[PDB]
Amino acid sequence: VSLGHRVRKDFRILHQEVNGSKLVYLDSAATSQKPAAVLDALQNYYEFYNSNVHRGIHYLSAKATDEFELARKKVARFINASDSREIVFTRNATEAINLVAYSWGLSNLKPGDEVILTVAEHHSCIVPWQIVSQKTGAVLKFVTLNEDEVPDINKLRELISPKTKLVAVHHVSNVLASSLPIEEIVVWAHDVGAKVLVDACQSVPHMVVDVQKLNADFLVASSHKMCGPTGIGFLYGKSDLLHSMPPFLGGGEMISDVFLDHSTYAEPPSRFEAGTPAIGEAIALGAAVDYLSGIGMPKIHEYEVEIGKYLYEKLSSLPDVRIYGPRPSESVHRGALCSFNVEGLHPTDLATFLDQQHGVAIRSGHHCAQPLHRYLGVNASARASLYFYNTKDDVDAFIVALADTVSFFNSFK
Amino acid sequence: VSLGHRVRKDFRILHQEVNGSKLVYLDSAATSQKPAAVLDALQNYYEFYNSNVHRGIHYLSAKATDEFELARKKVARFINASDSREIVFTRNATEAINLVAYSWGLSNLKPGDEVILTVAEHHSCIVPWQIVSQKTGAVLKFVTLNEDEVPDINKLRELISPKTKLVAVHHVSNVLASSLPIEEIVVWAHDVGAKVLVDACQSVPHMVVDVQKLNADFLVASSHKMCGPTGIGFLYGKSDLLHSMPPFLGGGEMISDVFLDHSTYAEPPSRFEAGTPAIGEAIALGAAVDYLSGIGMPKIHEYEVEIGKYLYEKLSSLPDVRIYGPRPSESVHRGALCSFNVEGLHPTDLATFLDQQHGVAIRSGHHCAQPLHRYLGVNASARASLYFYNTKDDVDAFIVALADTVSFFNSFK
């Protein structure tokens, strides 16, 4: 019995009919579904020991604080951070990138300083750095794609110079499904004194991530993509860097002392956590980490490689389909998603008919990567994305339904 | 059957023993407990229709989006906002104040411009304005207290001048339990062209709040204090004002278009909601609003006035107790909390012993109001804070336990 067939039971939401058909959920890149263990953790928090954290003294507050801080350690261990104090809790990866942009970027970047991104970057990795650029006079250098539709790594390399102060790029693309060799990139960046921010939203849920191995300076991720609740994510940052950084959000809990004329600030990570945090959600994220760890991230990744390949092979066998990004092989890895279009058909029509007539859930749009879609010559793409609760059966159902959907719209032509 | 005795059943957490004693929770000003209705909403979201929101098409996504936006309307209705688009979702009131500080403050405050606050302000007010002052040359003006330990309204009004750009003050104080005449203050501020930001963290959970009546420009609150989940809060802002303000956090969803060289931004509230929001938590906050509305905010306020008065009377009857803030009267209304100290005893000792020996949960510290405590001549106070699930029996138990605790520490003297 495959991994997907073994774990499906844990995810209550998968066992329903939508629009008359068995639900087939293929939108995990937009957000993931939650196992009972995580939901249980969340309910247990609110039912039994909810109270505000830090400075609290009383039994419930002490327990809430202990569990909140243990969750921070769980996340630390998940990505192999050396110290749990290098983990900062935010609402999502987006806010975590903004934290870096405001706190680190506004205080380190000077006119002429260069920040390197790729054209495949998610909006949350583009927009904050545009804003910093506008404020500091720093300039964004974009890495275009090669013929295999992956960021041109040769074109990344010679972009790195003594003027480069930051590289901010995906670990795995949410559209192309391709990866970047972060570890090498970090070496090249450090060689000129530049820092590296890793947008790890599509790697943290799906494969082993070791921030000490990568040696990345910053790393970001969202709970909602990794079986955890919405409303929380995190910033990993090297202790020495966090310590060098000024506060972003101000208020309760992040101060040491407050006087009328000025305040002094706590050390990281508290320095960066203003006011009452998402306590229950942090605890449930910890439960999500325990859940994924229990299955095992190597196991999840090997399973995803298999179903990902299966999806790619079956999808690409349909005529008139183009799948964006690299071909899978011995050397080139793909995440378990495919972004695609079908000749003469609008992906929104595909997604709508798939949902309404077949109960298949995919997404249509630019997937927060508008310049990428621009570069590839389209305004939108259809995207089917998998997680470890999906099965080859799901892929088979998708392919049958997609073939039907294409047949339907082509019948009027 | 009193309100507290009728609703206690809804709150699973109150029915336990801690340290061998029945729990008596008197720390609702730090955070509130959650009724089953709210927890059910949260669980139902994750089990049945979790999916990312906006741009989604498929059945679960449509439902999640409908419920997420319906929750925004529930909040807008709760505070009588004229338009649901005047509600912006944040992590907490602290972030909402920071949004105003960064987006409105940095773009509108010039050297010499003044911002008025009181010495009783929460840190999440004080710190963001301090930082804005440091960046813009603006100057903070603090309102001191009068003989009745309430911010001196005469001094407040006299500070209002052509140089006043913002008044940022609490509706109700989280320490003093006193309120400010916000509607009146708004009139004086608008007459010199200043804006008013209302820190409504301690009013929204406890009394009818009507932003059109107050006519305030900004208002903030946190979900966790009003029977809702941690991880979400909101900014209310006049539509015209929100439209004039630049983006704070950047990334997905808050954009209209993204190009390599620049981005255009959505209109409010989307403009200020970057990346995947706390979807489940917003929906549960809507359930909290429904739950409070079902009881009735007038019933709640009337009940709190009764038990607040009872607590004040019983507490002030104990020798050597000093309660901070104004005395109850028909003129002066207090929120249902008391911050206090006992002659010669440290409040941390009182809180620790109350918890360990009596299962009574209160808080000791500066309650994020360190300048207020400094003003009053202490570093910390004990605080007992009630909500509508507390009863006169709870107050009785507190008073019995407090007298014991005082007796214990004074026995070594």
- Are the Cβ atoms of A275 and B91 closer than 8 angstroms? yes
Q: Which of chain B's residues have a Cβ under 8 Å away from the Cβ of A352?
A: 57
- Are the Cβ atoms of B281 and A51 closer than 8 angstroms? no
**How far apart are the CA of A330 and the nearest CA of chain B, in angstroms?**
33
Q: Are A350 and A333 in contact (CB under 8 A)?
A: no
Query: Looking at domain A35-295, which CATH architecture does it have?
Result: 3-Layer(aba) Sandwich (3.40)
Phi and psi for A261 in degrees, rounded to 5?
A: -80, -30
Tokens matching residue B212: 């059109």
Phi and psi for A265 in degrees, rounded to 5?
A: -120, 150
Please indicate if any CB of chain A lies within 8 Å of the CB of B352: yes
Taking the C-alpha atoms of residue A182 and residue A189, their distance in angstroms, rounded to an integer, is 10
CA A281 vs CA A297, B14, B52, B373: distances in Å: 22, 21, 17, 32
Tokens matching residue A376: 């590839």
Closest CA to B350 of B400, B396, B409, B397: B409
Q: Report CA torsion sign: B224, B225, B227, B232.
A: negative
- Are the Cβ atoms of A252 and B122 closer than 8 angstroms? yes
CATH for the stretch A1-28+296-413: 3.90.1150.10
Q: Which helix (H) or strand (E) holds B411?
A: none
Cβ burial of A273 (10 Å; 0-12, 13-18, 19+) is buried
* Cα A225 to the center of its chain, rounded Å: 6
Q: Report CA torsion sign: A255, A257, A260, A262.
A: negative
CA B153 vs CA B156, B178, B189, B373: distances in Å: 5, 12, 13, 19
**How far apart are the CA of B80 and the nearest CA of chain A, in angstroms?**
25
Phi and psi for A158 in degrees, rounded to 5?
A: -85, 0
B333 contact partners, CB below 8 Å, separation of at least 6: B179, B305
State the alpha helices, DSSP H only, in A118-273.
123-136, 153-157, 182-190, 211-214, 239-244
Please indicate if any CB of chain B lies within 8 Å of the CB of A144: no
Q: Which of chain A's residues have a Cβ under 8 Å away from the Cβ of B278?
A: 91, 230-232, 278, 281
Q: Are B397 and B21 in contact (CB under 8 A)?
A: no
State the alpha helices, DSSP H only, in A264-320.
279-295, 297-316
b vs e for A163-200, b when ≥16 Cβ sit within 10 Å of the residue's Cβ? ebbbbbbbbbbbbbbbbbebeebbebbeeeebbbbbbb
B16 contact partners, CB below 8 Å, separation of at least 6: A48, B22, B23
- Are the Cβ atoms of A275 and B371 closer than 8 angstroms? no
CB nearest B18 (choices: A13, A59, A122): A59
**How far apart are the CA of A102 and the nearest CA of chain B, in angstroms?**
9
Q: Which residues, numbered 360 to 389 in chain A, qualify as contacts with chain B under a Cβ-Cβ cut-off of 8 Å? A: 360-365, 368, 370-371, 374
**Are β-strands A337-342 and A381-385 bridged in parallel, bridged antiparallel, or unpaired?**
antiparallel
Tokens matching residue B389: 């699930």
Q: Are B286 and B75 in contact (CB under 8 A)?
A: yes
Taking residue B246's Cβ as centre, other Cβ atoms within 10 Å add up to 13
Q: Are A116 and A141 in contact (CB under 8 A)?
A: yes
B182 contact partners, CB below 8 Å, separation of at least 6: B169, B171, B196, B198, B214, B216
Taking the C-alpha atoms of residue B18 and residue A60, their distance in angstroms, rounded to an integer, is 8
- Are the Cβ atoms of A34 and B50 closer than 8 angstroms? yes
8-state DSSP, B326? P
Taking the C-alpha atoms of residue B165 and residue B114, their distance in angstroms, rounded to an integer, is 6
Domain ranges of chain A: 1-28+296-413, 35-295
Tokens matching residue A329: 């092989």
To one decimal, the resolution in angstroms is 1.7
Q: Are A232 and B276 in contact (CB under 8 A)?
A: no
Q: Which of chain A's residues have a Cβ under 8 Å away from the Cβ of B362?
A: 58
- Are the Cβ atoms of B231 and A281 closer than 8 angstroms? yes
CA B234 vs CA A298, B178, B353: distances in Å: 40, 23, 36
Closest CA to A349 of A395, A409, A282, A280: A409
Strand partners, B220: B199, B235
Taking residue A148's Cβ as centre, other Cβ atoms within 10 Å add up to 12
Taking the C-alpha atoms of residue B366 and residue B385, their distance in angstroms, rounded to an integer, is 14
Q: Which residue of B has its CA nearest to A27?
A: B51
3-state secondary structure of B402: helix
- Are the Cβ atoms of B364 and A57 closer than 8 angstroms? yes
Taking the C-alpha atoms of residue A160 and residue B343, their distance in angstroms, rounded to an integer, is 66
3-state secondary structure of A210: coil
* Cα A133 to the center of its chain, rounded Å: 23
**How far apart are the CA of A149 and the nearest CA of chain B, in angstroms?**
18
Please indicate if any CB of chain B lies within 8 Å of the CB of A230: yes
Q: After which residues is chain A broken (C to N over 2.5 A)?
A: none
Q: Are B246 and B103 in contact (CB under 8 A)?
A: yes
Q: Which helix (H) or strand (E) holds A86?
A: none
Phi and psi for A264 in degrees, rounded to 5?
A: -105, 160
Q: Are A252 and B94 in contact (CB under 8 A)?
A: yes
Taking the C-alpha atoms of residue B13 and residue B23, their distance in angstroms, rounded to an integer, is 9
**CA angle at residue B221 from B216 to B223, to 5 degrees?**
150
Q: Report CA torsion sign: A145, A150, A154, A157.
A: positive
* Cα A253 to the center of its chain, rounded Å: 27
Closest CA to A17 of A386, A355, A348: A355
Q: Which residues, numbered 35 to 94 in chain A, qualify as contacts with chain B under a Cβ-Cβ cut-off of 8 Å? A: 39, 42-43, 46-52, 55-61, 91-94
Taking the C-alpha atoms of residue A82 and residue B197, their distance in angstroms, rounded to an integer, is 42
- Are the Cβ atoms of B374 and A259 closer than 8 angstroms? yes
Taking residue A409's Cβ as centre, other Cβ atoms within 10 Å add up to 15
Closest CA to B385 of B129, B153, B199, B201: B201
CB nearest A57 (choices: B127, B224, B351): B351
- Are the Cβ atoms of B263 and A126 closer than 8 angstroms? yes
Taking the C-alpha atoms of residue A385 and residue A307, their distance in angstroms, rounded to an integer, is 10
List B125, B227, B338, B368, catalytic entry: B368
Taking the C-alpha atoms of residue A50 and residue A68, their distance in angstroms, rounded to an integer, is 11
- Are the Cβ atoms of B128 and A255 closer than 8 angstroms? no
3-state secondary structure of B365: strand
- Are the Cβ atoms of A230 and B47 closer than 8 angstroms? no
Q: Which of chain B's residues have a Cβ under 8 Å away from the Cβ of A13?
A: 46-50, 60
ω into B298 cis (within 30 of 0): no
Taking the C-alpha atoms of residue A103 and residue A249, their distance in angstroms, rounded to an integer, is 9
Closest CA to B101 of B246, B203, B310: B246
B377 contact partners, CB below 8 Å, separation of at least 6: none
Q: Are B253 and B275 in contact (CB under 8 A)?
A: yes
Q: What is the dihedral of CA A140, A141, A142, A144, to 10 degrees?
A: 170
Please indicate if any CB of chain A lies within 8 Å of the CB of B224: yes
Question: For the packed helices A279-295 and A36-44, what is the interaxial angle rounded to 10 degrees?
Answer: 150
Render A370-383 in DSSP notation, one character per residue: HHHHHHTT-S-EEE
Q: Are A203 and A209 in contact (CB under 8 A)?
A: yes
Q: Which of chain A's residues have a Cβ under 8 Å away from the Cβ of B130?
A: 250, 262-263
Q: Which residue of B has its CA nearest to A251?
A: B124
Test the B interface: residue of A90, A224, A258 with most B CBs within 10 Å: A258
Q: Report CA torsion sign: A115, A87, A201, A246.
A: negative
**Are β-strands A24-25 and A360-361 bridged in parallel, bridged antiparallel, or unpaired?**
parallel
Q: Which of chain B's residues have a Cβ under 8 Å away from the Cβ of A52?
A: 27, 30-31, 224
Q: Which residue of B has its CA nearest to A350?
A: B57
Please indicate if any CB of chain A lies within 8 Å of the CB of B4: no
Taking the C-alpha atoms of residue B332 and residue B146, their distance in angstroms, rounded to an integer, is 14
Name the experimental technique: X-ray
CA B41 vs CA A371, A399, B67, B364: distances in Å: 38, 35, 11, 33
Phi-psi region of A394 (alpha: psi -120 to 50; beta: other; left: phi over 0): alpha
Q: What is the dihedral of CA B45, B50, B54, B58, to 10 degrees?
A: -120
Domains A1-28+296-413 and A35-295 share a fold: no
Taking the C-alpha atoms of residue A168 and residue A160, their distance in angstroms, rounded to an integer, is 12
Q: Which residues, numbered 283 to 312 in chain A, qualify as contacts with chain B under a Cβ-Cβ cut-off of 8 Å? A: none
Test the B interface: residue of A100, A125, A220, A230 with most B CBs within 10 Å: A230
Q: Which residues, numbered 155 to 214 in chain B, qualify as contacts with chain A under a Cβ-Cβ cut-off of 8 Å? A: none
Question: For the packed helices A36-44 and B36-48, what is the interaxial angle rounded to 10 degrees?
Answer: 170
Strand partners, B114: B139, B164
- Are the Cβ atoms of A59 and B361 closer than 8 angstroms? yes
- Are the Cβ atoms of A59 and B359 closer than 8 angstroms? yes
**How far apart are the CA of A212 and the nearest CA of chain B, in angstroms?**
27
Q: Are A91 and A233 in contact (CB under 8 A)?
A: yes
Q: Are A307 and A336 in contact (CB under 8 A)?
A: yes
B270 residue type, one letter: S
CB nearest B370 (choices: A39, A257, A354): A257
Taking the C-alpha atoms of residue B257 and residue A12, their distance in angstroms, rounded to an integer, is 36
8-state DSSP, A295? H
Q: Are B354 and B407 in contact (CB under 8 A)?
A: no
Taking the C-alpha atoms of residue B260 and residue A225, their distance in angstroms, rounded to an integer, is 26
Does the annotation count B368 as an active-site position?
yes
As a residue count, chain A comes to 413
3-state secondary structure of A198: strand
CA B289 vs CA A210, B208, B294: distances in Å: 42, 12, 8
- Are the Cβ atoms of A224 and B263 closer than 8 angstroms? no
Taking the C-alpha atoms of residue B237 and residue B99, their distance in angstroms, rounded to an integer, is 11
Radius of gyration, alpha carbons of chain B = 22
Taking the C-alpha atoms of residue B351 and residue B340, their distance in angstroms, rounded to an integer, is 12
Q: Report CA torsion sign: B260, B98, A93, A382.
A: negative
Taking the C-alpha atoms of residue B228 and residue A50, their distance in angstroms, rounded to an integer, is 11
Q: Which of chain B's residues have a Cβ under 8 Å away from the Cβ of A33?
A: 50
8-state DSSP, B320? T
Q: Which of chain B's residues have a Cβ under 8 Å away from the Cβ of A263?
A: 123, 126-127, 130
**How far apart are the CA of B390 and the nearest CA of chain A, in angstroms?**
16
Please indicate if any CB of chain B lies within 8 Å of the CB of A257: yes
Closest CA to A193 of A168, A165, A235, A167: A165
Taking the C-alpha atoms of residue B239 and residue B246, their distance in angstroms, rounded to an integer, is 13
- Are the Cβ atoms of A94 and B251 closer than 8 angstroms? yes
**How far apart are the CA of A81 and the nearest CA of chain B, in angstroms?**
24
Q: How far apart are the first and last CA of chain B?
A: 43
Q: Which of chain B's residues have a Cβ under 8 Å away from the Cβ of A278?
A: 91, 230-232, 278, 281
CA B166 vs CA A338, A355, B308: distances in Å: 51, 50, 32
- Are the Cβ atoms of B47 and A13 closer than 8 angstroms? yes
A10 residue type, one letter: D
ω into B269 cis (within 30 of 0): yes
Closest CA to B260 of A109, A96, A121: A121
Which residue, chain included where needed, has tokens 């392919």? A399
Taking the C-alpha atoms of residue A199 and residue A173, their distance in angstroms, rounded to an integer, is 9
CA A282 vs CA A58, A166, B413: distances in Å: 20, 29, 44
Render B229-289 in DSSP notation, one character per residue: PTT-EEEEE-HHHHHHSPPSS-SSSSEEEE-SS-EEEPPTTGGG--SS--HHHHHHHHHHH
Closest CA to A78 of A197, A232, A234: A234
Please indicate if any CB of chain B lies within 8 Å of the CB of A106: no
Render B313-330 in DSSP notation, one character per residue: HHHHTSTTEEE-SPPP-S
Question: For the packed helices A279-295 and A297-316, what is the interaxial angle rounded to 10 degrees?
Answer: 80
**Are β-strands B114-118 and B24-25 bridged in parallel, bridged antiparallel, or unpaired?**
unpaired
